[PDB]
């Protein structure tokens, strides 16, 4: 959701991203880049992530010929599935309305009561 918590939690400062928003109001990263020549694989970004988006996976074979190619953009990071957390969805919890979830449709949320309602 491009909340920028992982970038500020990174002690090396090797995460850079910018928030964009869809038409229905869903936040997402416009870009997301990680300088892996700086990254110490400490896992503080995964710990800080409130959506379980960013994850450290069992893969060590990341050797490279050019150091510029260790800058991984969003196309090199976004995978096809949920990874280590198969079911969590932050947008099922958030009160912010997106496509497919109007106000009052999140978890533990009541339907909105308009102030012009006849009930006391």
């Amino acid at each position: 959701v491009a909340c920028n918590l992982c970038a500020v939690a990174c002690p090396v400062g090797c995460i850079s991203l910018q928030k964009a928003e869809t038409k229905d109001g869903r936040w997402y990263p416009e870009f997301f880049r990680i300088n892996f020549s700086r990254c110490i694989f400490c896992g503080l970004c995964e710990e800080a992530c409130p959506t379980t988006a960013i994850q450290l996976t069992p893969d060590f074979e990341m050797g490279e010929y050019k150091r510029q190619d260790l800058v991984y953009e969003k196309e090199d990071l976004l995978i096809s599935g949920p990874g280590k957390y198969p079911e969590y969805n932050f947008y099922r919890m958030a009160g912010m309305a997106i496509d497919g979830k109007d106000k009052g449709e999140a978890e533990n949320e009541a339907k909105p009561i308009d102030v012009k309602s006849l009930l006391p």
Partner: protein, 588 residues
């Protein structure tokens, strides 16, 4: 009263003794969370106070630490003397099992203190580092030169107005320093290093560094030799200076933990433990018992890893090469367990303020059982193949021996101090992290700290750590892995993912940082190579105002010339192999 509560320690008998000797208005007692009495002494009374402490009925025999502090940006200095800078002296009385921290206040222009080297000889390197990083002059010092930075360095990096970040790289300065390196071999002046009698026309001068093909790191020693006899030796250290304390002033309390990992890089969770304990003292957090047992088990696993590396490296330094292969196989078993628990091998960064990062994974006990069944036969085989060999005994026994007095006067801790016969282990004398609930022994020497005696003491420490791991495996509480304190950083992840209050706490803790109220805290632990301590000053902010790390390898490297003078060069290599140091621990 909790163990993290702020105390003035006015009921310490040393405060009454100082009252009786120097009067009540001669000093100011400061209430801290360091756990030791902190006394602000006038500069002109420092030598008298130190001599009085040295001449007590149960005396303060060891200068544990000596360093400086830039107090100019410290907003919360209530009940403190006016000071632009300060110098602190941490002294340990072994017989009392007590400490005291003397503090001398200094103005910005009058930045000179009388030297402490006549009372404690380890004050030489400590005052050289204080002069190097703070610009504080010590009057009467034999050679007050820079020890961390190169001699042609401008400024003092631990001052608050010094910028922490790396400057722009210039190849011109690199070529100038290369020319300095290649001209130093031709224009060596044996007076600027504290040496005397610079060629009797028989003293050959050799260099051992600045590159060393070993795991303890790369460093330079200048040797003055008469034939094969070392008549003088001065070290050149600071070749692995990483600015870890300055970085402590730059990272938040949470984001500094991976930096604590890389102080003594064979120690891992052992290195993390004193930092998180000191931060929890600042936060007022008492961790639950399962956290204590988890941290103890991780620290003992990493202690076994480090001791196996040390014993194998010593055997390789003697001349037998196969036990390092087998000890690295055992290290791979330990790394299998540590990888399973923390997800990393060497720098797990797994301890947290108020607990650990995750719960233990399902099935960790099977891997611990496999390691505990694998280890003892291998250790016995190592002993029978290499440690009982008479060639190794001839290389090790009687080499670089010192007694209790020399160990105390140089701040020697760990296996060397216990090999001198002094029974001082932090896990028993000043217990931490629930170590009192474990049944284990502290091996001590007969009175002579040899290379062989230190190695065998480390072998018995490995066996005791195996005993602690067996008790950890058999007795695990089924509780939380994180304390329920609001300053537990980060909060438990599932509550963060579904509760807004926990989400808010997590948001502010990982971004701006946890707010530690203004205090000073201290924690020393028995590390793999001696006593490792963190001294943290919070000015009320989300980062440390001052992070001071005392490491034992610094003291052991400073003790090197006192124990090796008059010996052979091969004895110096064996002594270097038997110290159990790393240069990252030395330079920080």
């Amino acid at each position: 009263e909790p163990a993290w509560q702020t105390r003035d320690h006015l009921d310490d008998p040393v405060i009454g003794e100082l009252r009786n000797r120097f009067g009540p208005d001669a000093f100011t007692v400061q209430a801290t969370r360091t756990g030791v009495p902190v006394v602000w002494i006038k500069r002109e009374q420092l030598l008298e106070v130190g001599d009085f402490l040295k001449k007590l009925p149960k005396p303060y025999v060891m200068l544990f630490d000596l360093h400086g502090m830039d107090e100019r940006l410290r907003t919360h200095r209530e009940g403190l003397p006016a000071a632009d800078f300060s110098v602190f002296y941490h002294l340990i009385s072994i017989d009392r099992n007590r400490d005291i921290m003397l503090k001398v206040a200094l103005a910005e222009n009058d930045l000179h203190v009388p030297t402490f080297t006549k009372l404690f000889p380890n004050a030489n390197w400590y005052e050289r580092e204080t002069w190097d990083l703070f610009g504080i002059t010590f009057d009467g010092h034999p050679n007050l030169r820079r020890i961390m930075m190169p001699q042609t360095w401008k400024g003092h990096p631990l001052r608050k107005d010094y910028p922490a970040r790396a400057t722009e790289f210039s190849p011109f300065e690199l070529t100038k320093a290369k020319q300095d390196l290649e001209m130093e071999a031709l224009t060596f002046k044996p007076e600027e290093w504290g040496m005397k009698r610079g060629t009797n026309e028989d003293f050959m001068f050799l260099n051992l560094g600045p590159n060393h093909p070993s795991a303890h790191g790369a460093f330079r020693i200048v040797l003055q030799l008469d034939g094969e006899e070392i008549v003088d030796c001065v070290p050149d250290i600071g070749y692995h200076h990483r600015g870890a304390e300055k970085m402590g002033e730059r990272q938040s309390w949470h984001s500094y933990i991976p930096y604590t990992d890389r102080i003594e890089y064979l120690g891992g969770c052992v290195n993390e433990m004193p930092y998180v304990l000191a931060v929890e003292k600042l936060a007022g957090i008492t961790v639950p018992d399962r956290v204590n047992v988890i941290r103890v088990m991780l620290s003992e696993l990493f202690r076994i890893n480090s001791h196996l590396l040390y014993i194998s490296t010593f055997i390789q330094d003697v001349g037998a090469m196969t036990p390092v292969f087998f000890a690295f196989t055992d290290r791979q078993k330990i790394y299998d367990l540590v990888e399973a628990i923390t997800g990393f091998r060497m720098h797990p960064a797994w301890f947290r303020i108020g607990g650990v990062a995750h719960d233990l994974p399902r099935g960790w006990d099977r891997l611990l059982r496999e390691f505990l069944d694998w280890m003892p036969k291998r250790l016995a085989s190592y002993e029978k193949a290499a440690l009982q060999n008479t060639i190794l005994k001839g290389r090790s026994q009687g080499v670089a021996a010192y007694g209790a007095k020399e160990a105390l006067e140089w701040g020697t801790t760990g296996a060397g101090l216990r090999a001198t016969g002094i029974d001082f282990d932090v896990r028993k004398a000043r217990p931490y992290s629930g170590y009192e609930n474990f049944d284990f022994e502290i091996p001590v020497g007969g009175g002579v700290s040899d290379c062989y005696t230190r190695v065998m003491l480390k072998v018995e420490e490995l066996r005791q750590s195996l005993r602690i791991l067996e008790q950890c495996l058999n007795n695990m509480p089924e509780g939380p892995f994180k304390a329920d304190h609001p300053l537990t950083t980060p909060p438990p992840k599932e509550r963060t993912l579904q509760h807004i209050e926990t989400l808010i706490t997590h948001f502010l803790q990982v971004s701006w940082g946890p707010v530690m109220p203004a205090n000073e805290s201290f924690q020393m632990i028995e590390a793999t190579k001696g006593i490792n301590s963190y001294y943290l000053t919070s000015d009320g902010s989300t980062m440390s105002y001052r992070t001071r790390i005392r490491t034992p390898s610094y003291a052991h490297l400073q003790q090197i010339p006192a124990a090796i003078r008059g010996s052979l060069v091969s004895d110096l290599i064996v002594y270097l192999g038997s110290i159990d140091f790393v240069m990252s621990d030395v330079d920080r």
